[PDB]
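Q: I'm writing a short methods note and want an example of a predicted protein-small molecule complex. Could you take the sequence and the SMILES for ammonium ion and return the bound structure as tokens? Please keep the output block clean; save any remarks for afterwards.
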Amino acid sequence: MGAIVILVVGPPGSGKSQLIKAIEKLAREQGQPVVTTSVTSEDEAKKVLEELLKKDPNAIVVIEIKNPRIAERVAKRVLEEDPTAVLVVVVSSPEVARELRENLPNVIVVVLRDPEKLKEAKKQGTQVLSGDGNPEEAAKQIAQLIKDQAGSWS
Ligand SMILES: [N+]
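A: Understood, no commentary inside the block.
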């Protein structure tokens, strides 16, 4: 099918590790292998992606990003390394999400509050899903969105 790459973007305290735990658990239940990596710089991402996303592995790769400022370059690096990867960016801030949407043609999702900033994000194509603070629902919602817009997830 191809690689599904999920960037999970947000500062410490955004729910990333719990969201990632829920995504891994649901994926195991569906018989799909998931691997995770946490990156702090664009080259770290290059290093791990150039090793891992070698031959469009049929796998889910989750990338944890604690520094939202690097998200865009890491997203671009993913596409550079594997132009045949599905890329889903789960972002904590609606403002970051809007900025990433403007700079990429990639699925960008917010589960997370300010109604005005959220509307602005959605206007640039940010997708909103229920399950902020409920990792299990969130994981379910993300998997449904990937199925409907990207493929089986198998
Ligand atoms: N919200």
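A: Remarks, as requested: The chain has one domain: 3-149. Helices lie at 16-29, 42-52, 71-81, 94-103, 115-123, 135-149.
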